[PDB]
Amino acid sequence: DFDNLFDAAIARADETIRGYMGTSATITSGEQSGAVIRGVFDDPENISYAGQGVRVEGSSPSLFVRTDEVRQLRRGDTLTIGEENFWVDRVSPDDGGSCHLWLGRGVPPAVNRR
Amino acid sequence: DFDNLFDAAIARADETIRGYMGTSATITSGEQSGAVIRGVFDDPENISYAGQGVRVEGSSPSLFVRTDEVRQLRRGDTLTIGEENFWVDRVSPDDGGSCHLWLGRGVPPAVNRR
Amino acid sequence: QLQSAIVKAMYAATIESELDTQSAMDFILGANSQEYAA
Amino acid sequence: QLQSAIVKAMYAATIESELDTQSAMDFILGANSQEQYAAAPVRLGGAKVPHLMPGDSLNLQTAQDTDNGYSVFEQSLLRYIAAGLGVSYEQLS
Amino acid sequence: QLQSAIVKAMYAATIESELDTQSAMDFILGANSQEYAAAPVRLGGAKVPHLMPGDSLNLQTAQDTDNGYSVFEQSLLRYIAAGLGVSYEQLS
Amino acid sequence: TRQEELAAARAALHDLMTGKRVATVQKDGRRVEFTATSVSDLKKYIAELEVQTGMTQRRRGPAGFYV
Amino acid sequence: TRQEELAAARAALHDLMTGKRVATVQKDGRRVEFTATSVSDLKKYIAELEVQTGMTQRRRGPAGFYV
Amino acid sequence: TRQEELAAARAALHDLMTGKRVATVQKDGRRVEFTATSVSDLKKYIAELEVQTGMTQRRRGPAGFYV
Amino acid sequence: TRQEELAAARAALHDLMTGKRVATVQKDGRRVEFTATSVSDLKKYIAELEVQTGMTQRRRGPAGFYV
Amino acid sequence: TRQEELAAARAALHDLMTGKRVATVQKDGRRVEFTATSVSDLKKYIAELEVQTGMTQRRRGPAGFYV
Amino acid sequence: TRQEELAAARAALHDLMTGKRVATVQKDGRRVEFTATSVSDLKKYIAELEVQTGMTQRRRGPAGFYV
Amino acid sequence: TRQEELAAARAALHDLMTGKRVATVQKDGRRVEFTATSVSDLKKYIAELEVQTGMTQRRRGPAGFYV
Amino acid sequence: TRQEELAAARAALHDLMTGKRVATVQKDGRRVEFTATSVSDLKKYIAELEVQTGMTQRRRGPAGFYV
Amino acid sequence: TRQEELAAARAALHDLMTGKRVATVQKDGRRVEFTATSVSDLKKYIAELEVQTGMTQRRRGPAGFYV
Amino acid sequence: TRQEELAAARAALHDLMTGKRVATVQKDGRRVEFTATSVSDLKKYIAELEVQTGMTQRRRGPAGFYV
Amino acid sequence: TRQEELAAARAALHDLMTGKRVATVQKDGRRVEFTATSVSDLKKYIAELEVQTGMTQRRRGPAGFYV
Amino acid sequence: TRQEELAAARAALHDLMTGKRVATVQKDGRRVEFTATSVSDLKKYIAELEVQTGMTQRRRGPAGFYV
């Protein structure tokens, strides 16, 4: 399908790495609603100081799902990594065979659209 | 046990490094109370200057503990590296098989929560 | 011993080639494929 | 010694292949064409030359001399035996 | 020397294979496993077996059973006949 | 539980032969390395545990000889 | 399914033969390296697996001699 | 407890055979590499260790010859 | 599709001979490398599928002798 | 104090055999490696200090012959 | 197209002979490497492909012997 | 002091045998690699320095033969 | 254009012999490397295309013998 | 000055045997490696340089025979 | 001009012998690595390139034996 | 300038023998590499340069036998 | 200029043997290496030019034999 002869290799590699290191994930709400995908989850640490001193330790989760399933995910809907409940905040653009999924935590904050 | 094929390897490696590189930390206070962990401790050296010259040179200890035995550890409780008395400040999120325990020194300062 | 002798003498030579066997005997052992039994 | 001569000459050759035994013996030795385990016989016709692909090889054992040396050893033993029995060696042997 | 010749002649071939020895003898030395004493095998005509890679049937070449033992005997009973005083050809 | 063992080993052989046996994987920090077996020993393993299991006849006995 | 992986292995032989057998593929951060086999054993695998398939004649029984 | 590491080593043999014997695993500066052994030695280990344990008959005393 | 197989094999042989067979490419973040096959195996491959296809005679039978 | 030496050596043989003998460890600046010994010398060492210790017979002497 | 391809092969042979057979070429981030043959195989390739085309002969039927 | 390095070398032999013969040790910025010997020469050194030490009988004068 | 070919090849031989055959050249961010032919094949090529051209005799035919 | 030569050489032998011969040492920005001699040559050096010393005999002349 | 490269090659031979034959020169960002030749081929080059030059006697026609 | 040259050579031999023959030495940015020679050649150099100099007898004129 | 050539060759031999033949130097962006010549070729070269020069006898001719 890919008129490149290289994206086939990168797609096979992405499938292999997702199968060898990834974890299952069940998306909830959104247009997908009940659906299961696979992605390599990670949770880097990050700190901030809101003044003379306010330590707010947190995490910046990422999932790295393939772009085919991540389509029409928008941003409001949420997702469960096993038991833990996150919510997609930002979706990275296609890098050729996949895209990083930026996750939040807890209930998404309102919509505040209009 | 895990839909991983990889995290099992990293857990085995984690146990290996803990056994080959680490110390027998013993914990007092907290819900865990008397317990023993095998954590590799390091003491990087950090200095602040404050005013004109107010060098307050000190250390920032870390333990690299495994998450399973250190759940619900909280922050206010103390710790003992052999004959030395420390106290945990914050717990890093799990990277997959363990987490970094950030340690203080001396008595923990109050609670100041109400 | 008689059977072993006849068997050992009955195989003569061998050929080896990844090429098709019919064409292999065609191009090496003369053959008559141009005109079950082999 | 007689049994060893029996079995050393019994296994004339071997065939080396990763195919099925029936197919291997068909393509290297022949026969089959069964009317309707015991493997398969081979008709002892004229000289036949097989064809192989890499990984296959027909190698026939050279075996060893049947009487590598036995007749002289038996000769000495029979000499001793005839000495024991008091009869001439040649008459006994 | 008699016993050594017996032993050297009483080991003709060797089978080496990954799989079970019963099936190995079934697929190499004919065997009659369809019917401890291991397995007997009929002594029929010449049999050529097929063996997968990693197996091998090795025919032991043995060794000459009289590698000079006859001449040593000649010398020894020459000495014996010298001792007893009878002629060597009479004794041996 | 030998039959699915046969299936897994045969599949692994197939992926090894064409293109689909992975030696190492890596994602910007998390990487794994797999020891790669050769082809000969893998086919020997296939044949051994295939004849050992309830799989039917594949190799028969020695070839007879008649006139 | 002998036809399927027969054709797959034949195509694998072809594109390994010319230029297309990918050994390692790496996008920045994510790299994998599929293991590589020789061409000889691949050819033997192709031969044995097609002859095991019920495909047409490819071999003959030795060769007779006559005057 | 011989059956325990008998089963463990059999599983290790299969795991190495297909694709899964991990050699080195690394994550963000935490890397551990395990030494690897040839499959032949592991096979012989399976052999005489299962012989040593009370596992069933798998070897017979030579082979008789009779007409 | 044998004829274009022959054509592609002849091409790849020509590029391999002079300078035009690429072992690997790199694009500052995306690189790939292909397994390189020896020239001899390529020549046997081209000869085999050249004689197997419907193209004309190339090699004849053995040479006779006469006085 | 040879018995626990036997136990430790036999263990280490087992871990080397299956998957669990470590060659290198690294903690982003705290790394160390160990020399690797071949399995043949491991089994030779095991046998030598196994027969040398007070544990029971494992190997008998020659083999008689009778008619 | 055989004549000009033969000319190109001869030019490539000369270029490899002196100094100019480029193996790898690299810019900032962009690099490729071309697989390299030996010189003997290229020489015999030039040889028999020049023979196969209709250009003037370079071989002769063995040799005679007269007194 | 022969007993001292006898014990030290025996302990080192066992240490190298199991898993723990350190080859290179590296803290951040401070690394050092110790050279590694084989195992056979270590055994010969052990035996020679043991017999040189007035340790008990370990070798006997050949072997007689009686009928 | 054989004569300038001879000149260039003899030159390249001379530069290769002493010091002046560049295997690779690298400016910052732009590097290339050329395949390094050996010297024996270089001399054979020199001799072959030296005798093939119209330049004079360099070697003669056998050698007689007289009393 | 050869007795201390004996002592130094023997100490180096022991250190190399157990674990205590350093192949290279690196502090941050300052590293040096030493060429590592083998074992056999070191033992010949030991023997040749101890026999030349005045310390007592270690090897004696050839052995005769007597009935 | 035979004296020119004769002297040049002789000087290069001596230069490679003593210490000075540069194989790789590297300024910051500019690296050039020349190829290297074995000494025997350079010595030959000297030999035939000087005998082809009209240099003095250096060879003699075999050697006769007389009583 | 021969005797002290021999002394320096012997000191270098011992220096390489124990542990202290520096191979490479590196400071920040500044590093040099010293080539290494096998111990055998250094030993022969010591031997025949000692013989060449006026050092005392160490060789004897073969050996005769007498009844 | 044979005499100082011989002197330089002898000096280079001396530095090569003990410790002082530099393989490469590097000053934080200014690196250069030299090809290393084996000691055997160096001694052959030194002997050849030593007997080539006008200095006195070193090797004489055959050896007589008188009763």
Interface probe for D, chosen from G42, G46, G59, G66 (most Cβ of D below 10 Å), is: G59
Strands A35-39 and K30-34, how do they pair? unpaired
Q: How many of the other CB atoms lie within 10 Å of CB of M2?
A: 12
CA of J25 to nearest chain B CA: how many angstroms apart? 6
| Cβ–Cβ < 8 Å for N19, N12 | no
Residue H66 lies in a domain: no
A24 → closest Cβ in B3, B5, B92: B3
CA angle (G1, G7, G9) in 5-degree steps? 105
Instruction: Provide the residue type at Q10 as one letter.
Output: R
Measured distance CA(O47)–CA(O39) in Å, rounded:
12
Measured distance CA(L9)–CA(N16) in Å, rounded:
11
* φ, ψ dihedrals at G37, nearest 5°: -115, 165
Question: What is the H or E stretch that residue G3 is in?
Answer: helix G2-18
Measured distance CA(E30)–CA(P56) in Å, rounded:
79
Measured distance CA(D40)–CA(D21) in Å, rounded:
10
Contacting partners of chain D (3+ CB pairs under 8 A)? C, E, F, G, H
Q: Which of B25, B31, B63 lies closest to B44, judged by CA?
A: B63
Structure tokens at I28: 């500052």
Residue H39 lies in a domain: yes
Residue P63 lies in a domain: no
Interface probe for N, chosen from L14, L35, L38 (most Cβ of N below 10 Å), is: L35
- Give J37's DSSP letter: P
Which residues, at least 6 apart from A54, have a Cβ–Cβ distance to it below 8 Å?
A: A48
Question: What is the H or E stretch that residue Q4 is in?
Answer: helix Q2-17
CA angle (F3, F7, F9) in 5-degree steps? 115
Structure tokens at P23: 């191979």
Residue G22 lies in a domain: yes
Structure tokens at A14: 């992405």
Q: Please judge whether I32 and A96 are an interchain contact, meaning their C-beta atoms are less than 8 angstroms apart.
A: no
Which residues, at least 6 apart from I48, have a Cβ–Cβ distance to it below 8 Å?
A: C18, C19
* φ, ψ dihedrals at O39, nearest 5°: -65, -35
| Cβ–Cβ < 8 Å for C20, G58 | yes
Measured distance CA(P47)–CA(P42) in Å, rounded:
9
CA of C24 to nearest chain I CA: how many angstroms apart? 9
Tell me if residue L30 falls in helix, strand or coil: strand
Helices K2-18 + K40-52 axis angle, to 10: 160
Q: Which of E59, E63, C6 lies closest to D8, judged by CA?
A: E59
Q: Please judge whether B17 and J25 are an interchain contact, meaning their C-beta atoms are less than 8 angstroms apart.
A: yes
Structure tokens at H10: 């059999």
Q: Which of D14, D11, D16, D12 lies closest to D52, judged by CA?
A: D16
Chains H & J: contacts with CB separation below 8 Å: 50
Q: How was this structure determined?
A: cryo-EM
Contacts of G16 in chain I (CB under 8 A): 35, 37
Measured distance CA(I10)–CA(H56) in Å, rounded:
58
Instruction: Provide the residue type at G55 as one letter.
Output: M
Contacts of A81 in chain B (CB under 8 A): none
Measured distance CA(L37)–CA(L16) in Å, rounded:
10
Give me Rg for the CA atoms of chain G. Answer: 18
Q: In what order do the strands lie in the sheet with A101-103?
A: A35-39, A23-28, A78-81, A84-91, A101-103
N25 exposure class (CB count in 10 Å sphere: 0-12, 13-18, 19+): middle
Contact with chain F for residue E53, Cβ under 8 A: yes
Tell me if residue H26 falls in helix, strand or coil: strand
The span from the first CA to the last CA of chain M, in angstroms, equals 47
Q: Which of B64, H15, G30, H11 lies closest to F32, judged by CA?
A: G30
Residue found under tokens 């690099």: K31
- Give P54's DSSP letter: T
Say if P and Q touch: at least 3 Cβ pairs within 8 Å.
yes
Question: What is the H or E stretch that residue F31 is in?
Answer: strand F30-34
Measured distance CA(C30)–CA(G63) in Å, rounded:
11
CA angle (P48, P51, P54) in 5-degree steps? 145
* φ, ψ dihedrals at C9, nearest 5°: -80, -15
Tell me if residue N25 falls in helix, strand or coil: strand
Q: Which of K25, Q26, L41, D91 lies closest to I24, judged by CA?
A: K25
Which residues, at least 6 apart from D74, have a Cβ–Cβ distance to it below 8 Å?
A: none
Domain range B22-114, its CATH number among 3.20.20.70, 2.40.10.180, 1.10.1740.10, 3.30.230.10: 2.40.10.180
**DSSP string for B81-103:** ETTEEEEEEEEPPP-SS-B-EEE
**DSSP string for I8-42:** HHHHHHHHHHTT--EEEEEETTEEEEEPPPPHHHH
Q: How many of the other CB atoms lie within 10 Å of CB of E89?
A: 8
Residue M20 lies in a domain: yes
The span from the first CA to the last CA of chain Q, in angstroms, equals 47
Instruction: Provide the residue type at D64 as one letter.
Output: Q
| Cβ–Cβ < 8 Å for L5, N17 | no
CA angle (N20, N22, N27) in 5-degree steps? 125
Measured distance CA(N34)–CA(P20) in Å, rounded:
6
Measured distance CA(E53)–CA(F45) in Å, rounded:
11
| Cβ–Cβ < 8 Å for E2, H27 | no
Measured distance CA(Q67)–CA(Q65) in Å, rounded:
7
Contacts of D28 in chain F (CB under 8 A): none
State the resolution, in angstroms. Answer: 3.3
Strands B35-39 and B84-91, how do they pair? unpaired
Q: How many domains does chain G have?
A: 1
Measured distance CA(N39)–CA(L48) in Å, rounded:
14
CATH number at residue H17: 3.30.1580.10
Q: Which of M27, B111, A37 lies closest to K28, judged by CA?
A: M27
Instruction: Provide the residue type at O46 as one letter.
Output: I
| Cβ–Cβ < 8 Å for A100, G29 | no
Q: Please judge whether M29 and K27 are an interchain contact, meaning their C-beta atoms are less than 8 angstroms apart.
A: yes
Residue J32 pairs in a beta bridge with J25, L25
Structure tokens at P19: 């542990």
Domain that holds residue I1: 1-57
CA of O17 to nearest chain Q CA: how many angstroms apart? 6
Residue K63 lies in a domain: no
Tell me if residue B35 falls in helix, strand or coil: strand
Strands B58-59 and E50-51, how do they pair? unpaired
Whole-number Cα distances in Å, E14 to A40, E29, E56: 55, 10, 8
- Give C18's DSSP letter: S
| Cβ–Cβ < 8 Å for H35, H24 | no
What's the 3-state SS for chain A? CCCCCCHHHHHHHHHHHHHHHCEEEEEECCCCCCEEEEECCECCEECCECCCCCECCEECCECCECHHHHCCCCCCCEEEECCEEEEEEEECCCCCCCECEEECCCCCCCCCCC
Give me Rg for the CA atoms of chain K. Answer: 18
Say if O and Q touch: at least 3 Cβ pairs within 8 Å.
yes
Q: Considering only CB atoms, which residues of chain B are within 8 Å of chain F? A: 6, 9-10
Measured distance CA(A26)–CA(A37) in Å, rounded:
7
| Cβ–Cβ < 8 Å for B66, B10 | no
